[PDB]
Write a structure and sequence with these properties.
5 strands, Citrate synthase (chain C), 58% helix, 4 chains, part of a larger assembly, binds magnesium ion, 16 helices, mainly alpha
Chain lengths: 373, 370, 66, 65
Amino acid sequence: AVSEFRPGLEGVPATLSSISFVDGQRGVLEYRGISIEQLAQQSSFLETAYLLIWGHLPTQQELTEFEHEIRYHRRIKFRIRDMMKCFPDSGHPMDALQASAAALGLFYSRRALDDPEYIRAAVVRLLAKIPTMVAAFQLIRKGNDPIQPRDELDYAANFLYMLTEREPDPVAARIFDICLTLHAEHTINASTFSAMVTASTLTDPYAVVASAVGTLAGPLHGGANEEVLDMLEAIGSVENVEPYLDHCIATKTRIMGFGHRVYKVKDPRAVILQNLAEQLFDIFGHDPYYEIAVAVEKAAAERLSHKNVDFYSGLVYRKLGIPSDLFTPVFAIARVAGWLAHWKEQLNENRIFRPTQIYTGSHNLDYTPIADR
Amino acid sequence: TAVSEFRPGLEGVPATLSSISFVDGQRGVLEYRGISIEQLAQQSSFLETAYLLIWGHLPTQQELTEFEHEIRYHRRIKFRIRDMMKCFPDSGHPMDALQASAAALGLFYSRRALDDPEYIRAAVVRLLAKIPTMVAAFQLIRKGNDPIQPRDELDYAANFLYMLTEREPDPVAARIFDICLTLHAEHTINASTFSAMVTASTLTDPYAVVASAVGTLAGPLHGGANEEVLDMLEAIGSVENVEPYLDHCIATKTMGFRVYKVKDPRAVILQNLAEQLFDIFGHDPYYEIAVAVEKAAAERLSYPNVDFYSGLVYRKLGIPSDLFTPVFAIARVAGWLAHWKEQLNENRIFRPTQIYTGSHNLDYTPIADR
Amino acid sequence: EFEHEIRYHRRIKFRIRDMMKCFPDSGHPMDALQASAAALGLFYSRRALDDPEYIRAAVVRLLAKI
Amino acid sequence: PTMVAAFQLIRKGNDPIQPRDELDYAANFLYMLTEREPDPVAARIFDICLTLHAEHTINASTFSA
Ligand SMILES: [Mg+2]
Ligand SMILES: [Mg+2]
Ligand SMILES: [Mg+2]
Ligand SMILES: [Mg+2]
C-alpha cells in the first residue's frame, strides 16, 4: 500500500513523447499537435501515419513515393499464405494476426540496425502487409482463395475489396480511412506500452507489432466492439429500446463502450464517428439495427446528463460489410502507425524497461523433503 | 503544485506486489517462494520449482506425479502446428519462430474465456510441455529433418535433448540441464516478465502473453546472450592468445554482456556445473580457453562473469547457439505463467501516463504549400 | 482367414488422409465418410464379379478401412 | 528457363512469375527473374549472349550428354 506504488502504473509517466496529446477534462486529442478533427476532415491514414512516424506532414513527392512503396509491398509471400492455410478454421482472428506478424519477421527480420533505410522498409512492409494478411485469414478459413491486392485501388479500398472481392463505393472508402486515422494513436495505451517494452530490448520491429497485437486482443483494451452489436440484436425493435436499458440499469458490475474512459468525457473520435456513420447510412440506406442504435443514443441522454466510440465503430464496420470477428484486427491495422511511431522514438533514446516489485512473500525458508503439507 | 518525477525505464519504480521471487543484490541472494536457488538447484526439479513459483507451495508427491503426468500427455504437438513450421523459412531466426508458434497454439486452444481454475492449469501444462517440443521441431525442420517424437520414458530435460539430437542423454548431463532450467526460471520483474504482465492485464489469452514475452526476451539487451561469448572464445583461439586478447579489448574496443554489483548466485552454480560436465564428458579447447579467460579476467576484473558459462554448458550438451535464447524461454515460461496468475487476481490494466515534449494547437498545412 | 485379412487392410493410404486434412474442420462427419468411401474406389476400382476374389477383397477392404 | 527463374522466386519465398506470351524468349526470362519487362536493347544483348554460349564443340558437358 506504499504511496510510491500505484496499481497499473496509473499517473506514472513511462516516456517523454511528442507523438500524441489527449486531455480527459477537455475533449482534445492531437497527433503531432494537430487536432484529430482537422486531420479527419482533410487527411489520409497514410499521411497521418507519416506525420506520426516522422513528425512532419509529408511533401507531395514524399507522400506519393510512400504510397508507391506500400503498393509494391502489399502482396504477401506464398509461404505466409500456406501457414495460414495450416491455421485452424475456427481460430480467433487476432491470435492469427500475432502469428502472422511474427512470421513476417522470420523473413524480413534480417536487419540493418542503425541504418535509416531499415526503419522505413519495415514501416512500409508492416503497413502494407498487415491489411493483406487479415483479409487472407478471412478468405482462407472459409476454404476460399485469398483475393490478391489490386494496384489501382487505394489502401482503404483494397482492404475492403480483398475481404469482399467487390470494389468499395469511393465515398465508403473515405469513411473507412477516417476511421483508420481515428484509431491510429492514443498516447501510452496498453498496446503501445507493450510495444515500447518489446522495443526496449532492441528486438526486431515485426515482433513489437506481434506483442502489441496480443495486448490489443485481450478484452479490457481489446476491442469490445462486438458486444455492442450483440446487445443491439438483443433488442429486436426500436420499440423495446426503452425497456431493455432499464432492466440493464440493474447491472452485473460491467463497463464497455470505452467504459475505461481514460478521457473522463466525450472522446472526440466518437463524435466524428457518429457523424461519419450517419452520412454512410443515409447514402447506403439505414439498417434496422442502426435505427435501434440511434434510439439507444436518445435513451443515453438521460444517462448522458450525469457523468461507446467502439460502439459507433462496430456499426460503421457492419455497413461496410466487415465481419465482427475482424473488428479488433481493423483496429490493429490503424494502431500499427502509432505502434511504429513509438518504436522509432524509443530507439532514439533507449533504456530497457526494467521495473521493481514490492515483496509480500517469505524469506530464509529451508527446502522440505517431500512431506505432506 | 509539486515537483514531477520521471524515472527513465521505470527504473526503481514498483509495478506490482509479488510473492514469486526476491533478488537482494549486494548480498547476492535469489529466492523462489522464500527458498534459496542453491537449495532448489541441489534438491529440486525444474518442474517442482515450476509448481512452487506458479502455485506457491512446494508440491506433495501425488501432486508432483500428477503434474508430471499431465505434462507428458501434452508434450506432443498438433500436425497443423508442425505443418506451419514447415512453411517457415529455413534461415529464419529461431526466437521469432517461437513467438509465432506460441501465438498459433492459441488458435487451437483459448476456447475457454474461463474463470475456471482448470483453465489456468490447462494452459500451464500445455505451455510448459509444448514450448520445449516446438523449439526442437524448428531445429530439425529447418534442416529438412522430420521432428523427433517425444519419448514417455524420458523426463523433461532429457526429452528436449533427445528431440534436439535424436540420442538419449547421459543421466548426469540431463540433471545438469534441469538445474540450468531451474536457474533461469524466475528473476523478478524482467522486461520479458513485465511484457507478460502488461499483455495479461488486458485479459488476453495466456498463449498470447507467452508470445509477447518471447519477443521481448529475443532482443539483445535482455535475454539475448551467449553466442557472442563463445564467439569471442573461438576468436582468441588459444590459451596463449588469452592474456593478449583481453588486454586489447580492455585497452580499446571494450566485453560482451550487469544486473547487480555482486556476483549472480546463478553464475556460481553454473560454473561448478560446467566444471563437472567438462571433467566427466571431456574438456574441449573452447572450455580451456574459457578457463584461462576467467582466471585472467579476475585479476583485471578484481566482473561481467555472469551466465557466460551457460553457453559453454549448452554447447557441450550439443544445443546449437541459435537455440540458446529459446532454451531460456523454456525455463522462464514458468515465471511468466506464475506472474500471469498473480496479475489475474487484481488485474488492473496498465495505462501509464506520458510527459509531452510536443507542440499544441497547430493547424493542418495544405500539401500544395510545402 | 477373414479376421486376418481385415487386420492387414485396416491401415489407410496417405493420399486419402491428406484428402481428409483438406476437408473443412466444421464439415459434417457423414458427408465426410461418403467422400472417403468414394475415394477408396479410385485406388481400388478394378476387376469383375467373375472373380470371386474381387467380392471378397472389397468386403475386407471396406470393413477394415471405413 | 522457366524452371531456373522459378527456383529463384521460391528460394526467397516469392511466388513464381508466370511466362508472358507477348514477351520473347530473352525478355520472358528476365521478366521472370525481375517481374519488370526488360528494355529491348538489353533483351537483344542477352539473346546474343545466349547464342555465344550455345555451342563450343565437344566439351565436358556435351561429352557427358
Ligand atoms: Mg490514406
Ligand atoms: Mg496520457
Ligand atoms: Mg500537408
Ligand atoms: Mg557444344
